[PDB]
Design a protein around this ligand. Structure first.
Ligand SMILES: CC(C)c1nnc(NS(=O)(=O)c2ccc(CCNc3ncc(C(F)(F)F)cc3Cl)cc2)s1
Ligand SMILES: CCCCCCCCO[C@@H]1O[C@H](CO)[C@@H](O)[C@H](O)C1O
Length: 261
């Protein structure tokens, strides 16, 4: 009852952008549309970003610049997700190496679930909602960069059909991070103990918030499974980038996440 309230606060306290904020911008009541090099360059000059251009790896080309912008956003979400996880009382009681194991495997799964909030069929929100990058522009980048984001979109449209809100997402993301199936886990029974409480809290919240919902709890358990498949494909693509594109830098933190899978 109070656990669900605690998880939601931790979410609101740590994430820079809610699904409520993202949806109101996407619908209305105006973000700068990025669709080519001229608008992408304009966004760099005009728009206020978190990681300033000077902090990014040295300029190479358009496709690699977008890849670098994605790389920073990923790493920053990883930082926000580490603080959110710590904010769960049970999670911080686990030995730090088990905390790392959970984050090494759940992080991209959580990222893709939250990505659905800023994503629609035609593109996604950037620079704290100030800008909007089109899907066709990402489609226009050189291979393999044009092939990374496509399965995320295919997930995001199906996931947004469930119409979940920020209080549902807080528990969904919590359940993803606290997973007992992770390789190299030391105290697997304790992580399973936390997971069960989170999943029980999610079930009871999904009836209170979504009473007319047709099978919402088992649908979200299947969505967690689909998310694991999406991360596997992502690491595979990322490993291929490291072999083929031997001039584009991969952030050491992400290189470690992808190392095994
Ligand atoms: C090559 C490309 C398809 C990709 N490279 N890595 C990917 N990585 S990903 O894991 O799909 C991912 C995608 C998008 C975000 C926010 C992006 N944030 C963005 N921010 C700014 C711009 C820019 F520069 F165009 F304005 C574009 C995007 Cl997509 C976070 C993770 S997709
Ligand atoms: C393999 C996955 C491990 C990832 C851990 C991400 C950790 C969040 O670690 C952090 O980074 C910031 C600056 O670099 C700080 O301002 C925060 O107090 C902080 O805890």
């Amino acid at each position: 009852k109070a656990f669900s309230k605690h998880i939601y606060n931790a979410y609101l306290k740590n994430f820079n952008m809610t699904k409520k904020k993202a949806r109101s911008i996407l619908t209305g009541k105006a973000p700068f549309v990025i669709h080519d090099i001229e608008t992408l360059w304009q966004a760099e000059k005009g728009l206020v970003w978190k990681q300033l251009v000077n902090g990014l790896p040295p300029y190479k080309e358009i496709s690699v610049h977008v890849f670098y912008r994605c790389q920073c956003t990923t790493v920053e979400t990883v930082r926000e997700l580490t603080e959110f996880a710590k904010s769960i009382p049970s999670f911080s009681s686990l030995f730090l190496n088990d905390q790392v194991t959970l984050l090494k495997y759940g992080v991209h799964e959580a990222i893709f679930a939250m990505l659905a909030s800023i994503v629609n069929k035609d593109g996604l929100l950037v620079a704290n909602g100030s800008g909007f990058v089109t899907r066709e522009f990402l489609r226009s980048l050189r291979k393999p960069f044009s092939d990374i984001i496509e399965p995320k979109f295919e997930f995001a449209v199906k996931f947004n059909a469930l119409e979940l809100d920020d209080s549902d997402l807080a528990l969904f993301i919590a359940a993803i991070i606290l997973c007992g199936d992770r390789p190299g886990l030391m105290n697997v029974p304790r992580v399973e103990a936390i997971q069960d409480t989170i999943l029980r809290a999610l079930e009871f919240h999904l009836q209170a918030n979504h009473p007319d919902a047709q099978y919402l709890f088992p649908k979200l358990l299947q969505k967690m499974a689909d998310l694991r498949q999406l991360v596997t494909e992502h690491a595979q693509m990322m490993q291929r980038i490291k072999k083929t594109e031997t001039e584009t830098s991969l952030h050491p933190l992400l290189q470690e996440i992808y190392k095994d899978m």
